[PDB]
Write a protein that binds this DNA or RNA. Sequence first.
RNA 1: UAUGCCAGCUGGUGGAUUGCUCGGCUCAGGCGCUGAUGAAGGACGUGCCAAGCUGCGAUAAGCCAUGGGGAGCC
RNA 2: GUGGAAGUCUGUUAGAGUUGGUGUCCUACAAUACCCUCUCGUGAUCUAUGUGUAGGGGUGAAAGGCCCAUCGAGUCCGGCA
RNA 3: GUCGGGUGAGAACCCCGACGGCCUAAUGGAUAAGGGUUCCUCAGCACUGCUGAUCAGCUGAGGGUUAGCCGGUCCUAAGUC
RNA 4: AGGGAAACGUGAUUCAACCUGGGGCCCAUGAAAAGACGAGCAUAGUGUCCGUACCGAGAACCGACACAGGUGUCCAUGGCGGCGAAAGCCAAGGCCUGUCGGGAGCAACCAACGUUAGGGAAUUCGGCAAGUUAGUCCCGUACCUUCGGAAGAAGGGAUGCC
RNA 5: UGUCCCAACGUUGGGCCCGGUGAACUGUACAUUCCAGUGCGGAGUCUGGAGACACCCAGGGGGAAGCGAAGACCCUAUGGA
Lengths: 46, 81, 143, 56, 82
Amino acid sequence: GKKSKATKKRLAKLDNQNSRVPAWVMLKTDERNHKRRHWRRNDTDE
Amino acid sequence: SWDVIKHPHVTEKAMNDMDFQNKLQFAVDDRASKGEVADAVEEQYDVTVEQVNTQNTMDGEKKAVVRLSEDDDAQEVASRI
Amino acid sequence: TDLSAQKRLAADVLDVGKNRVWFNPERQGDIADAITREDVRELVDEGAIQAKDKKGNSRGRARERQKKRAKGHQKGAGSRKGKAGARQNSKEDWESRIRAQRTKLRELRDEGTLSSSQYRDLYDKAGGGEFDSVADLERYIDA
Amino acid sequence: TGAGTPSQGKKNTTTHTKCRRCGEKSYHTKKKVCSSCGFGKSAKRRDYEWQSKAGE
Amino acid sequence: ERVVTIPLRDARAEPNHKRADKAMILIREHLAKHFSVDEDAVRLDPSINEAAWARGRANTPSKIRVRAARFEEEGEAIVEAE
RNA sequence: UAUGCCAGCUGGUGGAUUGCUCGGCUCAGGCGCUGAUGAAGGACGUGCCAAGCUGCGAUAAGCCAUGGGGAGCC
RNA sequence: GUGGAAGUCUGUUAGAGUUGGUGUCCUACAAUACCCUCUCGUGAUCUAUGUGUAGGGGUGAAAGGCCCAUCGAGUCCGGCA
RNA sequence: GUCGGGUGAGAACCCCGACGGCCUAAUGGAUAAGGGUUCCUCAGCACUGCUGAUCAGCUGAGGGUUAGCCGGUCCUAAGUC
RNA sequence: AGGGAAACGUGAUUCAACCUGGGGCCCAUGAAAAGACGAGCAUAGUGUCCGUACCGAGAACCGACACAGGUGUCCAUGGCGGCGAAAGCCAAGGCCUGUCGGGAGCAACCAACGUUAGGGAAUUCGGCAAGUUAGUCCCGUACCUUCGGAAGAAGGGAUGCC
RNA sequence: UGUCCCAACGUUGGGCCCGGUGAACUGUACAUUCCAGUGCGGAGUCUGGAGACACCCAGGGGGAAGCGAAGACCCUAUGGA
Ligand SMILES: [Cl-]
Ligand SMILES: [Cl-]
Ligand SMILES: [Mg+2]
Ligand SMILES: [Mg+2]
Ligand SMILES: [Mg+2]
Ligand SMILES: [Mg+2]
Ligand SMILES: [Mg+2]
Ligand SMILES: [Mg+2]
Ligand SMILES: [Mg+2]
Ligand SMILES: [Mg+2]
Ligand SMILES: [Mg+2]
Ligand SMILES: [Mg+2]
Ligand SMILES: [Mg+2]
Ligand SMILES: [Mg+2]
Ligand SMILES: [Mg+2]
Ligand SMILES: [Mg+2]
Ligand SMILES: [Mg+2]
Ligand SMILES: [Mg+2]
Ligand SMILES: [Mg+2]
Ligand SMILES: [Mg+2]
Ligand SMILES: [Mg+2]
Ligand SMILES: [Mg+2]
Ligand code: NA
Ligand code: NA
Ligand code: NA
Ligand code: NA
Ligand code: NA
Ligand code: NA
Ligand code: NA
Ligand code: NA
Ligand code: NA
Ligand code: NA
Ligand code: NA
Ligand code: NA
């Protein structure tokens, strides 16, 4: 498939949202990422 | 108004280009052309841009591989920041 | 130790199939430490990494058969599998024969043995398939 | 051929995409019309009274 | 140490396409018994392996002469073709 | 007296029950238009480290003025 | 003899199809699969991508077949408790 | 697959060698769609993997895609707005 | 220039690609437009913007799954074989991941399958299933027929190696 | 010509034992049953007898009018298409 510049931006953001809640936030909140998306098990939009 | 140069892209590969090819890599505003990147670069570091290669990254940002003239030395230009 | 990464590298550096690269069992540790293509070339030069040789099918037995068949053997009814016209293309064979006979008559003409009228008569007869071969043509020529 | 599983295999065509106007993935790239907001068909936004109970 | 002849007739009890494997097991079992040692301690030199697999996985030889030695602090045997 | 039946005891599983309420539901009074001076909505950004939410818009959890407020804040 | 015609023949060439085994499977590998067998294979042929036709309407070499596992009138939500 | 060996707290299935095999219009090589970071490296094993795992398409963190002359871009097709 | 450890060949045959001709067929007639040519040469400057990773499948796609299904193109000239892009065997390349293993001569029973004396369809709704036959050449070929065909009719013989 | 007379032997993968992984169907209760009888006329459970020490492994499926599906057949509905 041939992706456009926009599409590429979106996939990129999606990848970034795919990170984990940083360790420090755990400590700062005295205590999960519900938007975790696997490439195979999940499906993005467009 | 948006600025052309965002910051220096410093990674192992960026180093190799700098030490062996006299190139500097930067994170630039994706609306910027090679031409603009070239100018912005010369005016900020006072050097002579020979060539610019761009790539829209999977990081949402635009990367520019800027090669300086033999007259200038990437290693040094980068050492002052 | 896991040298699968290196295998991939050596195969590209030696320019050979991964399956042909050979790593010296006594130097896993060192190869294990090979991280760069250059590290690889280096171990290659020390002969710690080498490339096995590729085989080729022997054409020995093929050649002997080729000889027998070139001499006229091993082609009996019991050795044919395709239809006759398959073993020899009838149209292709006719083009061979007719050209021979047309080249023949062409020479005798220039050569003077045949008058452009005798030739013409023979040519037309040949195109009409009256001569089984050049020899048969020559024979007929001699009345 | 089974209209089931075996017919699912040819489904590699892209139709509904991320809509420029509403942000939903309902912009039919072949029709150039959004099935969600109506973008490409109507200047006004797509909306219907049946999207909710009659008295609400 | 000594030279022993291992019968591999029992590998025919195992499905034919897998004789080699079974034979290799018999050989280890044999040495372990005849040299009073744990089958864990029996080391077969590759030569033996190559002998058994010589005509493929399905055509193992009916016997095999094997040279073995016994020793060390936990008890063991090292063997090889002959 | 194995396999085992009934009841209980100690521990567990489970999350009922009781207690609690940052949420709902309904009534009532007030109030009430926005947009080409580009709205509402969306997208993508924006933090020292920042994934979500909120805010904000390349001056990006913010800039300025006046009033309030006060020794704390981010 | 030459020529090389054909909704022509043989053909697991590629590809298309789906006759029998009422085999295997039947909480499957699979909400239509596996194997052997079998039919077509220069044509009314097969096929990719693009494109048109929309629900009492399409499309149909016609079986009430097909229109996203949905068809003697699709699907979704509403009428609707 | 088998015998040795490597690493490791742990090895039938992670890695090296030999021996034995499998794939030949594909189980090889290059790609369209589609996927969307799955690519490489390092660090790991609570999850995922039809057993195990020191391995991984898994978990975490980093890195990676450079064009006047390859595509788009331009033209016009059925047709569409 | 490059590349090769080295040698760093010469001729030939058959010849995919590519080029260029001739014939035949249609109650079927086999796009368009941009653009190029037409229309020289030197030197110099400019050539921005988007894609570019990887999978491309018995684990990266669709099918709820690391699904025995489905999914387009190019490589159709690797060797023996042979009519062959067929079988079978083997290179190059890939793989031991169509991913759980250990043990019993390993019984009954089941799935796939081999061989069964004498008989030979008695089996069964039915020859279902299985089997027989087979490639190639020579001889030879009935009824019928729309004169095309029937036809590989049938039937008979040959077939290796040196 | 193993379709049959009439079956036999063998080959591979299961089946059986062991390590690891690890579901579903189904369940008012009780339940070791058999022969008879009786009952809404088709009973493991009533009545009379008979038999019956408990547990477990493997089997081929006689019974639980076995499990699966608010019977398609038929009739009825001031039902539908
Ligand atoms: Cl491209
Ligand atoms: Cl010609
Ligand atoms: Mg990342
Ligand atoms: Mg680019
Ligand atoms: Mg001819
Ligand atoms: Mg359907
Ligand atoms: Mg035909
Ligand atoms: Mg055919
Ligand atoms: Mg179409
Ligand atoms: Mg009908
Ligand atoms: Mg649907
Ligand atoms: Mg990887
Ligand atoms: Mg690792
Ligand atoms: Mg690439
Ligand atoms: Mg798999
Ligand atoms: Mg018999
Ligand atoms: Mg009879
Ligand atoms: Mg009878
Ligand atoms: Mg039959
Ligand atoms: Mg009923
Ligand atoms: Mg009826
Ligand atoms: Mg009616
Ligand atoms: Na996906
Ligand atoms: Na940056
Ligand atoms: Na108001
Ligand atoms: Na945040
Ligand atoms: Na003629
Ligand atoms: Na079939
Ligand atoms: Na309708
Ligand atoms: Na309704
Ligand atoms: Na050949
Ligand atoms: Na495995
Ligand atoms: Na039989
Ligand atoms: Na039963």
